[PDB]
């Protein structure tokens, strides 16, 4: 029974990406202080308990599934696509998500608002003409008041419908005040859609759409994610636990049931 750890994660042989102040979901969305992680890849992503969000206040209804899906894919490779958004203002920003001295927003999302006095029914399409799966991240804005809803989006109630040939999701925003987070009682809910080769993305909204800017390239393989506060150092160990790497000469280990790599069995 392997009973000791160095207390440090060895940076070999696995490609470790230390999240430092960032969770994987904040890196995915493009929280400004997480933008250093754009297009990065990993065998093991390490999330720290000190990680924090510093952008528009949000929730992700299927958080654990999105996180697991991205972690297994092992890359944040992102490709901007030329969505056309006619009759709305793009690149909206907020003082809850500062970028430098000014207002800003998630780097991978596009806050659309009315242009002039109208917000048309958006209906845009994006075919997948590649041979890999595309991951689209999108959102829905929940205004804190009815006045805010009509000021931003004109329509008294919005709707976001995103579909492929084999899926559809319709989200109705929920208006009302929440407690202030970085000054704001409004919220965004984050959703996702996978588009298989030969399929197509359709986005249809008459308000409250937080648009995707492109897609993440999905991959398959051995990548994962782990929560750990262990420091990284320069050394070699094939087996990583949140407590640190451990020797793998023994059949069992009692360090942690969470492990990554060629590891002894937990007992």
């Amino acid at each position: 029974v392997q009973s000791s750890s160095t207390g440090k994660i060895c940076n070999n042989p696995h490609r470790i990406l230390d999240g430092i102040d960032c969770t994987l979901i904040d890196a995915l969305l493009g929280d400004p202080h997480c933008d250093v992680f754009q297009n990065e890849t990993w065998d093991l992503f390490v999330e720290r308990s000190k990680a924090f969000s510093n952008c528009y206040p949000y929730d992700v209804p299927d958080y654990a599934s999105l996180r697991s899906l991205v972690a297994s894919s092992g890359t944040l490779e992102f490709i901007t696509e030329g969505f056309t958004w006619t009759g709305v203002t793009q690149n909206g920003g907020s003082n809850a998500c500062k970028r430098g001295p000014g207002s800003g927003f998630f780097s991978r999302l596009n806050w659309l608002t009315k242009s002039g006095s109208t917000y048309p029914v958006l209906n845009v399409t994006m075919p997948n003409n590649d041979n890999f799966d595309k991951l689209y991240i999108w959102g829905v804005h929940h205004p804190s008041t009815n006045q805010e809803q009509t000021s931003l989006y004109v329509q008294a109630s919005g709707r976001v419908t995103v579909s492929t040939r084999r899926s559809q999701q319709t989200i109705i925003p929920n208006i009302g005040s929440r407690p202030w987070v970085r000054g704001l009682s409004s919220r965004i809910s984050i959703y996702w859609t996978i588009v298989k080769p030969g399929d197509v993305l359709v986005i249809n909204s008459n308000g409250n759409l937080i648009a995707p800017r492109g897609y993440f390239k999905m991959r398959t393989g051995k990548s994962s994610i782990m929560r750990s506060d262990a420091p990284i150092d320069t050394c070699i160990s094939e087996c990583i636990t949140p407590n640190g790497s451990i020797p793998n000469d023994k059949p069992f280990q009692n360090v942690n049931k969470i492990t990554y790599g060629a590891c002894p069995k937990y007992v």
Partner: antibody, heavy 126, light 108 residues
Framework: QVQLEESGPGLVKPSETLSLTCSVS??????????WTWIRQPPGKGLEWIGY???????NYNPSLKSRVTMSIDTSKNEFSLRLTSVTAADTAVYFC??????????????????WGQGTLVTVSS | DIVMTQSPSSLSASIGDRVTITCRPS??????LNWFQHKPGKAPKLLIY???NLQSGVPSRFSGSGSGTEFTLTIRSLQPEDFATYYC?????????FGQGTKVEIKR
């Protein structure tokens, strides 16, 4: 944006049922995202959360009180209410009603009452 | 069932002074921690939500910090109107639970 006025007897006899009402002004109790909460504080003691109720029927009561407490929302009167059975002197307290907003990015469901009433004292005595 | 240990139970400080109140939950609660202020005869008021977010109308001399198992409410330059009892409140699992409170008194 909301006002919350509590009402109810003030004196309840031991073993009897305590009933309180919260009159809500400024929003509708039929809204999908708000929940309505009661909290209490015995004289000279700490605050104790009682429970929450959503218009859709979802409720959660403190296990210390769950086998004696119920809540309801009266949509017609724009009120919500507390019912606490088989009271003793331990239930003498200031009772506060409160509103919160479902916000699962930052809060457990129904767990962050952020607009409170000023409280009404209930004394359990013969 | 999470026990919130606030300290000190009471403190006195002069006008203009910096005041610090600590809260230590009985288990790690990440950032699911709120701070309430309760002035005599008024409704308890949420001051800080999710460990560090200032509520509307709250003066910027109030700030919340920390995460995990240790949280701090700071009042950076105490004013007479800040006389109140302050409570921490965890929103991490049910039932929500409160600290036993810190009574802040003004020295003059």
């Amino acid at each position: 944006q909301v006002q919350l006025e509590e009402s109810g007897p003030g004196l309840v006899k031991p073993s009897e049922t305590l009933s309180l009402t919260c009159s809500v002004s400024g929003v509708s109790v039929t809204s999908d995202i708000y929940y309505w909460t009661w909290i209490r504080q015995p004289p000279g003691k700490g605050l104790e959360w009682i429970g929450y109720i959503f218009y859709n029927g979802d409720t959660n009561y403190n296990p210390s009180l769950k086998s004696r407490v119920t809540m309801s929302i009266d949509t017609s009167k724009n009120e919500f209410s507390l019912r606490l059975t088989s009271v003793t002197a331990a239930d003498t307290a200031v009772y506060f009603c409160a509103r919160g907003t479902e916000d699962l990015g930052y809060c457990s469901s129904g767990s962050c009452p952020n607009h409170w009433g000023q409280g009404t004292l209930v004394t359990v005595s013969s | 069932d999470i026990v919130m240990t606030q300290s000190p139970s009471s403190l006195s400080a002069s006008i203009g002074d910096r005041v610090t109140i600590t809260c230590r939950p009985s288990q790690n609660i990440r950032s699911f921690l709120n701070w309430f202020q309760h002035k005599p005869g008024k409704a308890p008021k949420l001051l800080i939500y999710a460990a560090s977010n200032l509520q509307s109308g709250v003066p910027s001399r109030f700030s919340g910090s920390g995460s995990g198992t240790e949280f701090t409410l700071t009042i950076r330059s105490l004013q007479p109107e800040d006389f109140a009892t302050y409570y921490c409140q965890q929103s991490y699992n049910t039932p929500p639970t409160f600290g036993q409170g810190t009574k802040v008194e003004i020295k003059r």
